[PDB]
Every structure is written in C-alpha cells, then in structure tokens.
Design a protein around this ligand. Structure first.
Ligand SMILES: CCC[C@@H]1C[C@@H](C(=O)N[C@@H]([C@H]2O[C@H](SC)[C@H](O)[C@@H](O)[C@H]2O)[C@@H](C)O)N(C)C1
Ligand SMILES: [Mg+2]
Ligand SMILES: [Mg+2]
Ligand SMILES: [Mg+2]
Ligand SMILES: [Mg+2]
Ligand SMILES: [Mg+2]
Ligand SMILES: [Mg+2]
Ligand SMILES: [Mg+2]
Ligand SMILES: [Mg+2]
Ligand SMILES: [Mg+2]
Ligand SMILES: [Mg+2]
Ligand SMILES: [Mg+2]
Ligand SMILES: [Mg+2]
Ligand SMILES: [Zn+2]
Lengths: 36, 142, 206, 165
RNA sequence: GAUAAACGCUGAAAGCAUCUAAGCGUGAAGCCCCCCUCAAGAUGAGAUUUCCCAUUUCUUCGGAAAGUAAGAUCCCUGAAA
RNA sequence: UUGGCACCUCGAUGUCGGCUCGUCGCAUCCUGGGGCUGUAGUCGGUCCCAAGGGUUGGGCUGUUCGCCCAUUAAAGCGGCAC
C-alpha cells in the first residue's frame, strides 16, 4: 500500500474509489494500491 | 421591598415520569434540568429549590444523532499519572444508560451545593419499570 | 471448586517417591463447618460461608451464638465466604474435611502477610540506595518527589509507611499430602503469614 | 423480478420471508422502500429520488432476486487445492484440509451450507443463502490463499492468480 | 468480548465493476473483561445472617434527661501486631 | 538545535554532568498485527496500525556527545525550569 496525500491513477487499469471517507485507488497491479 | 420569595417546603414538589425513547440525549436533558430547577413555576426562587422530582424510563432507547454513538467519548481521570479512562456514548448507552443521562443532566444543573441537591431528585432507568409507584408519579410530555 | 480454612503450623520438607526433596507448609484444618449458603435470590450472589476453629463461649457474643445455632455448631474463630463453589455440595452444619483435596490438586493459598511495621523505600519498595561514600549524604532516601512543573507530587510517589499485614494470594501450589486423621494438608512451597496464621486454601482459579 | 414454481414470497410489514424447496430465508429491508407482491412477478417501489433511495432501491431488488434464486436452484462456489501434499477430506460434518501446516485445518459448515468433496484436490460449497456460501468459501480460501511464485494454495475454480519468477 | 491497520463476503449508487452506502464476517503485545489488591465518607453512606427490645421521670407542646439491654470501652497480662 | 526579541524575575527564579525517583509524547528501538517488494527460502527493504511491557554492563574523558570492548529481543527519540 502507498499511503500519500497525492493519490492518483498510475495506469489505465487504476480505479479511484472511496472507502470510509478515504480516497484510494485499487488496481490489478498491487504496486498501484494507494490510500490517501 | 415586596417581591415574593419561596420558603423551603412551601412549594409542592411533584413526581414526573418521562419516556426517553428516541429523544436526543440533550433536548431530553435540557428540558429535565429546567423541571428539576423549578424554572417552569412562577414561585421559582433562585436560592430555594421549588422544582419537581423526575423519573426517566427507557433511557436505553435515548437518541444520539450523527456518529455520536461511536465518536462521543466520555473521559474520567483517576488523578493518578496517566489515569485517563474513556467510554463511547454508544457503549455507555448499551451498558450504563442511567450513567449516560446522569452525566448529561449533571452538566446542565447549577455547579453548587443546590445543584448537587437537584441532582438527587433525578431517577434514571434503562428499562420501563421504576419502584417509585408510592410517589404516584404523573406522566410528563416534552 | 473446593475450599477450606486452616492455620499455618510451619514449614518442613518431604522426600518424593522419585527421591527429590521439596519444602512444604503444614496447614492444620480441623473444625471447618458450613454455617450459611448465600444464593442469588437472598443475597445476590452464590457463596458458602465456612466457620473454622472452635472458640470458648465467653469469647463469643449473643449475635455470634445466634448465627452458629442455625448450623447446630459452637462459635467459630474465623468465618470466611467461598464463591465459585457448587452449593449442591455443602449442607448447613456439615463438616468440611481436608480430603475435599487430593495429592496433586493445584490450589491458591490466601492469607495476610507478616507485619513489618514502618519501613523505608529500600525495604518497602526495593528502591536503590544512594552512594555510601564519595561524599554522598544520600543513603536510604526516596529519590526526587518529582519534576517542578506541576507544583505538586504525583499520586504514586512511593514513600515510607507500614509494610506488611496485606492480603496476599499465592497461585498454583501443589498439595503434596492429605492426612485426614490429623486434619493436615501439606502444600509445596510457602504461603503468607506468621505461624498460627489463617490460610484460605481453594482450588486454583487458573 | 420473476418468481419460479414452488417459491412463496410473503411480506410482513418491512421484512420479507421466502420459503422454497431448497430452504427458507428471512431478510429485513428498509421501510420507506416498498415492495409489491404478485402471483408470478415482483417490482420494487423507489418513493423519492435521493442518493440514499437510489442505492437502497438497487440493493432491495438485488438481494430479493438473490434470495428467490437462492431457494430455487441454489449457489455453488467451487475451490481447487494446488501444491504437492495439499488434500481435502470430508469426515462427518468437518472439512479437514492438509495444506502444508504442522496441524490439519477443520471447518464445520453453518446451518444451510454443505461441503461435499468429489476429489481430494478440489472442494465445492453448496447453499441457498448466497452470502453464507460466499463467506464459508472465502474462509476456506483464507487458510492458504494462492501464492505468486508456484501458484500453490486454495483458489476459486475461475480465479486468475498473478505469477512472479 | 469489541476494535486498529488490513483482508474479505454480499451489495447497489453507477445494467458493469466496487469491502460500503443498507447488511454480514475475519483481524493486534493495544481497548474492555478475565488475574491480584484496595474499595459503601459509593453522603448515591448498599446487602445478608444474628442479637437487644419498646423502661423510668418529665415536656401544654414538640422534645428533653437518666437508669439500662444487646454490645463496647477504660484498666490490666501481652505479641503473631 | 543554532538564533532573533528583551515581556516576568537583579530587596537572588542556583547554573553543566552524574546519582536517586520517575512521569508523559509517539515522529516505534524490541516484542504484536498488517500492505507493497527489484518478497523463491533464510534474511532484508519500505510503508501502515500499535505507547502494554521492555529497552545492558564496561574502557576513555568533568563531561553531555562520541568512539571503542563485550553483550542483548532491543540497546528508541523527545518533553517535564535542557
Ligand atoms: C546562570 C545563573 C543565572 C542566575 C542564577 C540565580 C542566582 O543568582 N543564584 C545564586 C544562588 O545562590 C545561593 S545557591 C549557591 C542561594 O541559596 C540561591 O537561592 C541563589 O541565590 C547564585 C548561584 O548566583 N539567578 C536568580 C539567576
Ligand atoms: Mg511485626
Ligand atoms: Mg545500584
Ligand atoms: Mg553517611
Ligand atoms: Mg496546579
Ligand atoms: Mg463484490
Ligand atoms: Mg472477533
Ligand atoms: Mg507477552
Ligand atoms: Mg521595547
Ligand atoms: Mg523577595
Ligand atoms: Mg504512530
Ligand atoms: Mg574519568
Ligand atoms: Mg537543568
Ligand atoms: Zn494501475
């Protein structure tokens, strides 16, 4: 998981979602998991 | 001069029973504080205690808006170093609702010897049954 | 969960069948009677009240005599409650013998520790002395009472004061021997209190 | 939503009960969201148009559909053990997995789910309540999830595991 | 027992997808229990068992004082304190 | 921290290091849980949760600091009139 204030798609497969009022991107590529 | 002043035991103090089911914890508490203080009687005298006795039933069903059930924290400090204990309003509404309502109303009473006497006139029950039937309590609406 | 009241007689040692040598406390537990059963209906909790040692009449008052008359027994020196027991066991006035335990039973021993009177922080709290030489004028003293900022001393600054005579529970002592005709338990190791001290032996909570 | 033969969808205030051949379900929905019964067909009524209601609407539909199809033909999640010495046994009501641990790992299915094991290398989880099937199947996969290096462990039968060196 | 990070199930909003919005689970030496000790001056002064009983003279009145009960103390012999 | 300012104290607010006694924060040194890995395994790296407890004895120097010896699961960093 990357935890950073700047969370944004790193490839075309990256999806930006919100869980529990936290912006995150989920992706097939696990390196691209990000939580804000 | 001539302004009336209530004497101790002059004004008839009545027993009221109030269902807490659904009412915001404050809102219930603010109305009850006024009844205990006697603010609803023209005989109101600031130094005397002309108020009524209040039984609250169903305190377990008391309302907590927003995320207050998880996010409203009640703190106690033992006065020992690092002796701060915390409880959520939610946990306290489940396990110790009598405590939850007493904390809420105590904060809205005068902070003095008379305020401490007024608090003794409050009876809180989690459920629907009190044991004060002898006092012939009259239902009160908010 | 079984329980009994005894007096600490003293310590000795026994050779095991193995050949090992173990220290034991001898607890004499004669004259334990069941005096009262507390129920949830009457008292709010389950407990059996056991009276231990027989006491001369002139040492007992009318309130005491009236309480042991219900159990058809004489006044008792020590009365203690046991919780976590099965009330179906225990009839009122029934003796409680040391054979409620068996060799190998793991017990908790509860008693009042020996009285050391007024004691300093070195003996009472195991604090360190200051240096004894190199110009030191600080030997058996409590250390700084605390920082400056809070213009007061926090509420567990350990200081001199009365030392023992506290209730203490030693957990998980093995019963090594039970002698019913002598009303004696042998417990491996030591239990709190001087010789002649009340000891409450009950089944290990763990 | 279409009701198949044998299914009796009833409604008691806000809570729906759906008793069928395979089993029987009881699920409490949000009041304001009202659901209409008919001899063959079911439609859900979204009263107002607020974010809350737009959502609940699609859910009450989806869950009711799931419930009904749940008591009709039912739900089968299928798992596939990979790796040397990975085997599942079925002894009574206990699914006993040997998946490389020093101890064996055992599972007792709840009220309504059944764990039949055709081959030792594969497991199948039958039930009517789809979430109860989902959870048990996940819990069994959770014991040894697929590892990326040799693909060993418990996977779902269609699952696509990422692979490394 | 309930949770953190996290992992999921079911699942729409958004015919897909999605751990989340409704709804279920997993999940820390941490939180609350469990363990040990103090604790009803907890003036909110709790409970149980047992004991003593309704005395005398005054006080218009309310109450007062003066012998006692159960029980405790003074005093004395002491230590396990 | 190095500083700036000069607002309290010059009819006195004792100033470094150590000893004794700690207590608090968490930006976590160890132990617990976890995501990613250029994670085969054993070791690691990095980030997230976590402050319950724990966190050594010596040589040199007044030292703090630091270097060194030998350990340790670890030899945390800070505040409390340094
Ligand atoms: C860098 C120092 C700063 C100043 C220090 C302090 C002071 O003057 N201390 C006095 C002290 O002398 C004795 S201690 C021997 C006294 O007992 C004590 O009370 C006290 O007066 C002396 C050391 O100079 N001032 C207020 C500020
Ligand atoms: Mg002594
Ligand atoms: Mg030392
Ligand atoms: Mg000296
Ligand atoms: Mg102060
Ligand atoms: Mg999904
Ligand atoms: Mg759990
Ligand atoms: Mg441990
Ligand atoms: Mg100036
Ligand atoms: Mg001065
Ligand atoms: Mg942190
Ligand atoms: Mg030197
Ligand atoms: Mg200093
Ligand atoms: Zn991506």
């Amino acid at each position: 998981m990357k935890v950073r204030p700047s969370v944004k798609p790193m490839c075309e497969k990256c999806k930006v979602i919100r869980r529990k009022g936290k912006v995150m991107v989920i992706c097939e590529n696990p390196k691209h998991k990000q939580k804000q | 001069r001539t302004t009336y002043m209530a004497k101790p035991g002059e004004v008839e103090r009545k027993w009221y029973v109030i269902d807490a089911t659904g009412v915001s914890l404050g809102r219930l508490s603010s109305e009850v504080a006024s009844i205990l203080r006697g603010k609803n009687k023209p005989q109101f005298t600031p130094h005397i205690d002309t108020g009524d006795f209040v039984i609250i039933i169903n305190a377990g069903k008391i309302g907590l808006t927003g995320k207050k059930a998880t996010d409203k924290i009640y703190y106690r400090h033992s006065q020992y170093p690092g002796g701060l204990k915390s409880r959520t309003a939610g946990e306290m509404r489940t396990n110790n609702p009598e405590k939850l309502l007493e904390l809420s109303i105590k904060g809205m009473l005068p902070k003095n010897s008379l305020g401490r006497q007024l608090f003794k006139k409050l009876h809180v029950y989690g459920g629907s049954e009190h044991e004060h039937a002898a006092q012939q309590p009259e239902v009160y609406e908010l | 969960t079984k329980g009994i009241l005894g007096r600490k007689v003293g310590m000795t040692q026994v050779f095991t069948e193995n050949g090992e040598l173990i220290p034991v406390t001898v607890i004499e537990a004669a004259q334990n009677v069941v005096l009262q059963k507390k129920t949830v209906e009457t008292d709010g909790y389950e407990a059996v009240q056991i009276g231990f040692e027989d006491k001369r009449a002139i040492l007992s008052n009318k309130p005491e005599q009236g309480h042991v008359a219900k159990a058809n027994t004489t006044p008792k020196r020590f009365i203690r409650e046991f919780r976590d027991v099965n009330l179906d066991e225990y009839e009122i006035g029934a003796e409680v013998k040391v054979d409620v335990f068996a060799e190998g039973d793991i017990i908790d021993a509860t008693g009042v520790s020996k009285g050391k009177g007024f004691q300093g922080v070195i003996k009472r709290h195991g604090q360190s002395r200051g240096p004894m030489a190199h110009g030191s004028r600080y030997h058996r003293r409590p250390g700084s009472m605390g920082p400056v900022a809070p213009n007061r001393v926090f509420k567990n600054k350990l200081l001199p004061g009365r030392m023992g005579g506290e209730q203490i529970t030693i957990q998980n002592l093995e019963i090594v021997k039970v002698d019913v005709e002598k009303n004696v338990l042998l417990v491996k190791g030591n239990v709190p209190g001087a010789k002649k001290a009340l000891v409450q032996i009950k089944t290990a909570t763990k | 939503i279409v009701i198949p033969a044998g299914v009796t969808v009833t409604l008691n205030g806000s809570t729906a009960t759906v008793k069928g051949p395979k089993g029987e379900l009881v699920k409490e929905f949000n009041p304001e969201i009202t659901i209409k019964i008919e001899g063959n067909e079911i439609n859900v009524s979204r009263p107002t148009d607020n974010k809350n209601h737009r959502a609940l609407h699609g859910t009450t539909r989806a869950i009711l559909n799931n419930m009904v199809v749940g008591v009709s033909e039912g739900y089968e999640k299928k798992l596939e053990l990979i790796g040397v010495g990975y085997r599942a046994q079925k002894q009574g009501d206990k699914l006993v997995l040997n998946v490389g641990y020093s101890h064996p790992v055992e599972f007792v299915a709840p009220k309504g789910v059944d764990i039949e094991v055709p081959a030792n290398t594969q497991v199948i989880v039958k039930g009517y309540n789809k979430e109860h099937v989902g959870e048990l199947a996940a819990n069994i996969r959770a014991v040894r999830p697929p590892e990326p290096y040799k693909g060993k462990g418990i996977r779902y039968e269609g699952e696509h595991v990422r692979r490394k060196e």
